[PDB]
Amino acid sequence: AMVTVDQQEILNRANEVEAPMADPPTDVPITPCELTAAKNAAQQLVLSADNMREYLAAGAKERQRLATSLRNAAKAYGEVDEEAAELTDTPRVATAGEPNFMDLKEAARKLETGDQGASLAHFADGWNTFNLTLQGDVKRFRGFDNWEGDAATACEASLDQQRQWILHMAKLSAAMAKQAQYVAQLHVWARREHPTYEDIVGLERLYAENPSARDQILPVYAEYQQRSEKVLTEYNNKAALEPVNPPKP
Ligand SMILES: [Cl-]
C-alpha cells in the first residue's frame, strides 16, 4: 500500500494511547452474613476483583508498549529520511462441605448477623460505573488520518485488538458487578423465606413451657425446620459464584 506518513500524528497518538485511564474501584465486598455460602461468595468476589485489577495493570503496560512502538516507527521514518539526505486464572473458592441444614436458631442467627448485602451493593456500583468508564475510553484506538500503508494498517490492527480487550474487560466488570447484586438479592430472599430467630425462640419457648401444646405445635416447628433446609440448600447452590477469568492483553 502507498505510504503516507505524518510523524507528528504518530507521536501524538503514542501519547494519547498511553494516557492514564481511571483506576478500577477498590471497594471490598464483605459477606452479607455469617453463613459459609455467603462468606465463600464474598471471597470469590475478592479473588475475581483482585485478578481483574492485576489484568487491568497488564493492559496499561500493553498501552505503554504500543506507545513505544509508535515512537520507534516515528523515529525510523526519521532515520530513513536522514539516510536519504505472570497472569493466571482466578482461584475457585471451594464450596464443598457447606451445611444444607442446621440447628434452626443457629441458621437464623447466622443469616441475621451481618450487613445483609450493603457492601455487595456498593461493590457492584463501583464495577458498574467502571464498565461505563472503560466504554468511554476507546477513542484512543481509532484509525489514523495521515498514516497509511502496511505499517499503519498493522498498527490499526493492534489498536483494534486493544479496543476489543478493553470492551471485553468492561463486559467482565459488569458481569462481576451482577454477581454481587445477585448474591445481595439472594440474601434478601433468604431473609424473607427463612424463619426468624425470634419466631423460632417464641415457638420453642411455648413448646418447652406447655406440655399439652407440644403434639399440636410440633408440626409448626417441623415446617420451620423444613423451610430452613430448603432456604439453606438454595443459598448454598445459588451463592456459588464462577471465578472471573479475564483475557490476557
Ligand atoms: Cl454456615
Instruction: Give the distance (Å) from ligand 1 centre to CA of residue 37.
Output: 6
Left, alpha or beta for 244 (phi > 0: left; psi -120 to 50: alpha)? beta
In a domain, 243, yes or no: no
Q: Which residue is associated with the grid cell 440474601? A: 187
Q: Which residue is associated with the grid cell 419466631? A: 199
Locate 113 and state its grid cell: 448477623
Q: How was this structure determined?
A: X-ray
**What span, in angstroms and rounded, lies between the C-alpha atoms of 86 and 97?**
32
Locate 100 and state its grid cell: 444444607
Rg (the chain; Cα; Å)? 28
Which amino acid does the sequence have at 231? V
In a domain, 89, yes or no: yes
Domain count, the chain: 1
Quote the DSSP letter at residue 94. P
Which amino acid does the sequence have at 45? L
Instruction: Give the distance (Å) from ligand 1 centre to CA of residue 35.
Output: 4
Whether the CB-CB separation of 104 and 224 falls below 8 Å is answered with yes
Instruction: Give the distance (Å) from ligand 1 centre to CA of residue 36.
Output: 4
In a domain, 245, yes or no: no
**What span, in angstroms and rounded, lies between the C-alpha atoms of 134 and 162?**
12
Instruction: Give the distance (Å) from ligand 1 centre to CA of residue 2.
Output: 68
Instruction: Give the distance (Å) from ligand 1 centre to CA of residue 106.
Output: 9
Instruction: Give the distance (Å) from ligand 1 centre to CA of residue 237.
Output: 13
In a domain, 58, yes or no: yes
Instruction: Give the distance (Å) from ligand 1 centre to CA of residue 114.
Output: 13
Which residues constitute the domain of residue 67? 7-238
Instruction: Give the distance (Å) from ligand 1 centre to CA of residue 33.
Output: 9
In a domain, 76, yes or no: yes
In a domain, 248, yes or no: no
The string of DSSP codes covering 8-68 is HHHHHHHHHHTSPPPPPP-PPPPPSSSSHHHHHHHHHHHHHHHHHHHHHHHHHHHHHHHHH
**What span, in angstroms and rounded, lies between the C-alpha atoms of 29 and 123?**
6
In a domain, 247, yes or no: no
Whether the CB-CB separation of 21 and 60 falls below 8 Å is answered with yes
Question: Which of 206, 220, 228 lies closest to 112 in space, CA to CA?
Answer: 228
Instruction: Give the distance (Å) from ligand 1 centre to CA of residue 113.
Output: 12
**What's the reported resolution, in angstroms, to a tenth?**
1.5
In a domain, 138, yes or no: yes
